[PDB]
Amino acid sequence: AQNPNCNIMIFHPTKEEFNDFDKYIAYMESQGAHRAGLAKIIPPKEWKARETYDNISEILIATPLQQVASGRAGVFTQYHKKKKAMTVGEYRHLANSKKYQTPPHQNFEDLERKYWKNRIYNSPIYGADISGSLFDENTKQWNLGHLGTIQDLLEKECGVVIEGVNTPYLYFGMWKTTFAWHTEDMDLYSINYLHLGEPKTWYVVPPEHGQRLERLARELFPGSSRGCGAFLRHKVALISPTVLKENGIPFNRITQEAGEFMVTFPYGYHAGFNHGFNCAEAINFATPRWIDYGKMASQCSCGEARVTFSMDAFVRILQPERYDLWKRGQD
């Protein structure tokens, strides 16, 4: 069995290997990359996502989210307070202000220590989940706006034609902006490209150990667990590496820098934080190996998780027994 310790693997495809996206994902899996839940892909030196980032300041962040924490430094939830719209140029200036800028630090490990010590005492503002793309239309390799759609994959594997679309999302971050512990909708893959700016630190639990993280989460967030049998679908809970180590939960960590891709694998729980002003683009995708994970994915039916239009068909076809309850949660 390849990668039996579930380490995060890093790949350096050649320009030739970068042509066929599906083939390269299958290659990485042949080497055991999925066992970690997360992989890094460094593009060949010849490749670029677009020519420059000099003309992005007029993109609108219609609903910036202030991420307000509650709890203790290693075990907290966050809620998202909506703020007034602002442009990317306005947001960049805010991220670089004395109130929000990255503190002086020695290295990534020092900054990680400062994040876990101090995150809860601040409320950073995240421009998340913005439909759009920064890939040039002429970029033919690993262009996250030109991937095969999940609807087409389900149709190819299972024969059923379904409604829905699959487009990318932009994330504009600042110091301390945080992504809570989650797997993807319907335990899909994700791919994330860091277009510009400061790094993003990731934490990940191997898919084969995901239920250990869920059991810890029910212990640490006991009111939330009574409210919903899949409350990590709410995407609000944080648990630090120190707390994970104290409770024996298997995990790994890695820092993504600008110009790098990360892939999350089905049922790979992940969480993380941004080091400073940055912009990422991410999208969900599927492969044949996903189908079995989609059929077994948990679902939030309490009303909190509220998701895209396109998840309807995935539930309806892969999980017909759960469909009626889940749809009630959507309405």
Residue numbering of the annotated binding site for Fe cation: 182, 184, 270
Residue 114: other Cβ atoms inside 10 A: 17
Binding of ligand OGA by 171 (CB under 6 A): yes
192 contacts ligand OGA (rule: CB under 6 A): yes
Q: Quick check: 264 binds ligand OGA (CB under 6 A)?
A: yes
Question: Are 205 and 245 spatial neighbours (Cβ–Cβ below 8 Å)?
Answer: no
Least distance between Zn ion and beta carbon 262 (Å) = 26
Closest listed residue to residue 263, CA positions, set 249, 243, 283, 278: 283
203-242 binders of Zn ion (CB under 5 A): 228
Q: Which residue is nearest to Ni ion (CB)?
A: 190
Is the CB of 156 or the CB of 226 nearer to Zn ion?
Answer: 226
CA-to-CA separations, 275 to 37, 70, 192, 236, in angstroms, rounded: 22, 21, 16, 19
Nearer to Zn ion, 167 or 225 (CB): 225
Side-by-side strand order, sheet with 269-274: 178-182, 269-274, 200-205, 252-256
Q: Interhelix angle for 311-318 vs 150-158, to 10°?
A: 20
The distance of closest approach from Cβ of residue 321 to Zn ion in the complex, given in angstroms and rounded to an integer, is 18
Taking the least distance from each CB to Zn ion, the nearer of 188 and 300 is 300
302 interface partner picked from Zn ion, ligand OGA, Mg ion, none, CB below 5 to 8 A per type: Zn ion
58 binds, among Zn ion, Mg ion, ligand OGA, none (CB under 5 to 8 A by kind): Mg ion
Shortest approach of Mg ion to residue 49 CB, angstroms? Answer: 16
User: Which one of residues 289, 304, 312, 323 is an interface residue with Zn ion (CB under 5 A)?
Assistant: 304
- DSSP structure class, residue 239: E
Q: What is the torsional sign of CA 189, 153, 138, 19?
A: positive
User: Residue count at the site for ligand OGA (CB under 6 A)?
Assistant: 8
* Amino acid letter for position 230: A
Residue with smaller CB distance to ligand OGA, 263 or 318: 263
Chain contacts with Mg ion (rule: CB under 5 A): 56, 58-59
Amino acid at 288: P
Q: Is 282 in the site for ligand OGA (CB under 6 A)?
A: yes
CA gap 260, 283 in Å, rounded:
15
Sequence ranges of the binding site for 2-oxoglutarate: 126, 192, 200, 235
Residue 10 forms beta bridges with which residues? 40
Q: Which of 22, 32, 18, 21 is nearest to 10 (CA)?
A: 32
Q: Indicate the residue among 170 and 237 with the shorter CB distance to Mg ion.
A: 170
SS3 (DSSP) at 146: coil
Instruction: Identify which of residues 239 and 280 has a Cβ nearer to ligand OGA in the complex.
Output: 280
At a CB cut-off of 8 Å and minimum separation 6, what does 32 contact? 1, 2, 3, 4, 9
Which residue, 297, 248, 269, is CA-closest to 206? 269
Please report, for the chain, how many H helices and E strands are present, in that order: 10, 16
136 or 292: CB nearest Mg ion = 136
From CA 30, how far away is CA 9, in angstroms rounded?
12
Site for ligand OGA contains 190 (CB under 6 A): yes
Annotated binding site: 126, 182, 184, 192, 200, 228, 234-235, 270, 300, 302
Q: How far is the CB of 127 from Mg ion (least distance, A)?
A: 13
Q: Which residue ranges make up the site for Ni ion (CB under 5 A)? A: 190
Q: Which residue ranges make up the site for ligand OGA (CB under 6 A)? A: 171, 179, 190, 192, 264, 270, 280, 282
Q: Which residue ranges make up the site for Zn ion (CB under 5 A)? A: 228, 300, 302, 304
